[PDB]
């Protein structure tokens, strides 16, 4: 017989309880169906780096950064 | 002007891209509205321990464990 407990800090550090809304927001912003986005990210689950988009203008890139999605990163190009 | 990349291991470790379906599943398993589950978890995001349920049957507990939700734990009662 078990007790169930939550560690709110851990939920937060994984992106929050509603992080799903933000995954959808990433997909919509990039106009990549969520299923396609997920498939590409999950293809090699132990992988540490797969490109999503390139030459993304700051307006779209800042928006994506502010979603604060776990495992999502940006770098300058050129 | 940026490249956007994913880290598939960080994404998996956080519970995955479709974690939202499973947070909904947790709320259902606990027989509570998702909004109430969200409100309790969001109450203090730096908090480390809140009880979600007590004296939970072995099978229900195993279902919860298999949702693989970040920050959700089981402990044995006595």
Numbering used by the authors:
A (entry chain A), B (entry chain C): 88 to 165
What does the report in the manuscript say about this coordinate set?
The penicillin-binding proteins (PBPs) synthesize and remodel the cell wall peptidoglycan, a major component of the bacterial cell wall that gives the cell its shape and rigidity. In E. coli, PBP3 (FtsI) is an essential protein of the divisome, catalyzing peptide cross-bridges between the glycan chains of the peptidoglycan. The overall fold of periplasmic PBP3 is bimodular. The C-terminal module is responsible for the transpeptidase activity but no clear function has been assigned yet to the N-terminal module of the construct.
